[PDB]
Design a protein around this ligand. Structure first.
Ligand SMILES: NC(=O)[C@H]1CCCN(C(=O)C(F)(F)c2cccc(F)c2Br)C1
Ligand SMILES: [Zn+2]
Length: 139
């Protein structure tokens, strides 16, 4: 679990979105595993606007933050699950690191701010759904 609170928006994994998230939907994309919903309280997370390939992510399965080197956002094949069939997920970034299902929603950050959230993993790897291109989150 985990979310990004920026202004009047809440960013979550699309497969983990609530009834309230769908009732106040702003935008959603199955190919990215993202869903954005409106909120009444104001958020204060800063989103990075950069091309950093190093950062720190939070891993709830270990109660620890880990430094990681990660790839540039791209189309990567993801094994079928109870939420999605076998498909290519876009805007996905991989790193060598610990993750298990339940870690989805953990924030990845560089010095410039929030880069994205845990979305895939397995085999000693971790995938993060990028959010730096969503310029409308700030405006
Ligand atoms: N983005 C997706 O399509 C997800 C949906 C949920 C399922 N999924 C997974 O990767 C996962 F849960 F099985 C997983 C397995 C081992 C380590 C992990 F950190 C994770 Br996350 C794909
Ligand atoms: Zn950065």
């Amino acid at each position: 679990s985990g979310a990004i609170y920026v202004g009047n928006y809440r960013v979550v994994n699309r497969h983990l979105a609530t009834h309230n998230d769908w009732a106040n939907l702003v935008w959603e994309d199955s190919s990215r595993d993202l869903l954005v919903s409106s909120t009444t309280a104001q958020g204060c997370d800063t989103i990075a606007r950069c091309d950093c390939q190093t950062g720190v992510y939070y891993c709830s399965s270990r109660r620890k933050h880990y430094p990681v080197s990660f790839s540039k956002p791209s189309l990567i094949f993801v094994e079928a699950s109870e939420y999605y069939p076998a498909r290519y997920q876009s805007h996905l970034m991989l790193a060598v690191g610990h993750s298990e299902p339940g870690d989805c929603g953990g924030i990845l950050r560089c010095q410039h701010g929030v880069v994205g959230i845990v979305s895939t993993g397995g085999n000693g790897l971790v995938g993060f759904a990028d959010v730096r291109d969503l310029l409308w989150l700030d405006e």
